[PDB]
Design an enzyme around this catalytic site. Sequence first.
Site, PDB file in Angstrom:
ATOM      1  N   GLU A  35      32.410  24.733  57.123  1.00 45.12           N
ATOM      2  CA  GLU A  35      32.890  25.142  55.689  1.00 45.12           C
ATOM      3  C   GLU A  35      32.966  23.824  54.965  1.00 45.12           C
ATOM      4  OE1 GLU A  35      33.690  27.665  54.803  1.00 45.12           O
ATOM      5  OE2 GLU A  35      34.312  29.101  56.619  1.00 45.12           O
ATOM      6  N   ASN A  46      35.022  30.752  44.261  1.00 46.26           N
ATOM      7  CA  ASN A  46      34.537  32.250  44.859  1.00 46.26           C
ATOM      8  C   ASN A  46      34.220  33.184  43.486  1.00 46.26           C
ATOM      9  OD1 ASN A  46      34.968  31.536  47.441  1.00 46.26           O
ATOM     10  ND2 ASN A  46      37.036  32.042  46.886  1.00 46.26           N
ATOM     11  N   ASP A  48      35.536  35.857  42.703  1.00 46.17           N
ATOM     12  CA  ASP A  48      36.469  36.614  42.185  1.00 46.17           C
ATOM     13  C   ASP A  48      37.504  35.720  41.294  1.00 46.17           C
ATOM     14  OD1 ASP A  48      37.675  35.390  44.297  1.00 46.17           O
ATOM     15  OD2 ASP A  48      38.481  37.140  45.211  1.00 46.17           O
ATOM     16  N   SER A  50      38.974  33.128  42.757  1.00 46.80           N
ATOM     17  CA  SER A  50      39.723  32.222  43.728  1.00 46.80           C
ATOM     18  C   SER A  50      38.934  31.067  44.061  1.00 46.80           C
ATOM     19  CB  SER A  50      40.051  33.181  44.843  1.00 46.80           C
ATOM     20  OG  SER A  50      39.046  33.572  45.580  1.00 46.80           O
ATOM     21  N   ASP A  52      38.325  27.713  47.273  1.00 50.36           N
ATOM     22  CA  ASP A  52      38.553  27.678  48.766  1.00 50.36           C
ATOM     23  C   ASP A  52      38.746  26.026  48.882  1.00 50.36           C
ATOM     24  OD1 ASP A  52      37.401  30.230  49.394  1.00 50.36           O
ATOM     25  OD2 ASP A  52      35.575  29.565  48.967  1.00 50.36           O
ATOM     26  N   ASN A  59      41.192  29.970  51.368  1.00 54.25           N
ATOM     27  CA  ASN A  59      41.288  30.533  50.272  1.00 54.25           C
ATOM     28  C   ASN A  59      42.752  30.770  49.492  1.00 54.25           C
ATOM     29  OD1 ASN A  59      40.298  32.458  48.127  1.00 54.25           O
ATOM     30  ND2 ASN A  59      38.951  33.607  49.543  1.00 54.25           N
ATOM     31  N   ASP A 101      46.710  36.349  62.370  1.00 54.93           N
ATOM     32  CA  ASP A 101      46.909  37.597  61.439  1.00 54.93           C
ATOM     33  C   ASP A 101      46.074  38.658  61.979  1.00 54.93           C
ATOM     34  OD1 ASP A 101      44.348  37.412  60.531  1.00 54.93           O
ATOM     35  OD2 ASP A 101      44.995  36.919  58.502  1.00 54.93           O
TER      36      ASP A 101
HETATM   37  C1  LIG Z   1      40.066  31.577  55.830  1.00 52.33           C
HETATM   38  C2  LIG Z   1      39.514  31.665  54.673  1.00 52.33           C
HETATM   39  O1  LIG Z   1      40.013  31.259  53.757  1.00 52.33           O
HETATM   40  N1  LIG Z   1      38.179  31.508  54.553  1.00 52.33           N
HETATM   41  C3  LIG Z   1      37.223  31.494  53.428  1.00 52.33           C
HETATM   42  C4  LIG Z   1      36.805  32.902  52.926  1.00 52.33           C
HETATM   43  O2  LIG Z   1      37.881  33.662  52.579  1.00 52.33           O
HETATM   44  C5  LIG Z   1      35.843  32.531  51.811  1.00 52.33           C
HETATM   45  O3  LIG Z   1      35.308  33.828  51.484  1.00 52.33           O
HETATM   46  C6  LIG Z   1      34.669  31.475  52.262  1.00 52.33           C
HETATM   47  C7  LIG Z   1      33.712  31.490  50.832  1.00 52.33           C
HETATM   48  O4  LIG Z   1      32.709  30.692  51.562  1.00 52.33           O
HETATM   49  O5  LIG Z   1      35.316  30.526  52.606  1.00 52.33           O
HETATM   50  C8  LIG Z   1      36.299  30.451  53.895  1.00 52.33           C
HETATM   51  O6  LIG Z   1      35.540  31.151  54.874  1.00 52.33           O
END
Ligand SMILES: CC(=O)N[C@@H]1[C@@H](O)[C@H](O)[C@@H](CO)O[C@@H]1O
Length: 129
Positions: A35, A46, A48, A50, A52, A59, A101
């Site tokens: 990650e 992202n 949309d 948002s 990360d 996210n 969750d």
């Molecule tokens: C648990 C969490 O927030 N995971 C995020 C996911 O939502 C997002 O789509 C992705 C993009 O690379 O990064 C992470 O995996």
Amino acid sequence: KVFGRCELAAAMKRHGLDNYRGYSLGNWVCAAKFESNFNTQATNRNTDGSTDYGILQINSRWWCNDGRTPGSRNLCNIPCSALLSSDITASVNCAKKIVSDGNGMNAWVAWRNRCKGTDVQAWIRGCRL
Ligand SMILES: CC(=O)N[C@@H]1[C@@H](O)[C@H](O)[C@@H](CO)O[C@@H]1O
Ligand SMILES: [Cl-]
Ligand SMILES: [Cl-]
Ligand SMILES: [Cl-]
Ligand SMILES: [Cl-]
Ligand code: NA
């Protein structure tokens, strides 16, 4: 902060992630590697709108407030900037809520695609824990 592999493994173990909801420590280290490359300051935007945040790329669509993701949730009840700290506590505490969750670690795309079904114990091999 850019963690070393074993340094992060030990930090995560101290914060209670080893076997949390059945996920051995190597799963969490593998997810962090892919990650964020172990970098607490990582951010990615992202499609949309948002973003990360942090070592586990949590996210803002659901989990933290960054003030610029309209109509999103803040289910960990934290500013997203808290996820960028060199202290991983806020990220770990939020990750515990996410993994509980119902969807387990499948919430982390990099875990699903690059860690799930691999020998994740390799990520903690050689480490003093
Ligand atoms: C648990 C969490 O927030 N995971 C995020 C996911 O939502 C997002 O789509 C992705 C993009 O690379 O990064 C992470 O995996
Ligand atoms: Cl493991
Ligand atoms: Cl927002
Ligand atoms: Cl820490
Ligand atoms: Cl599960
Ligand atoms: Na949000």
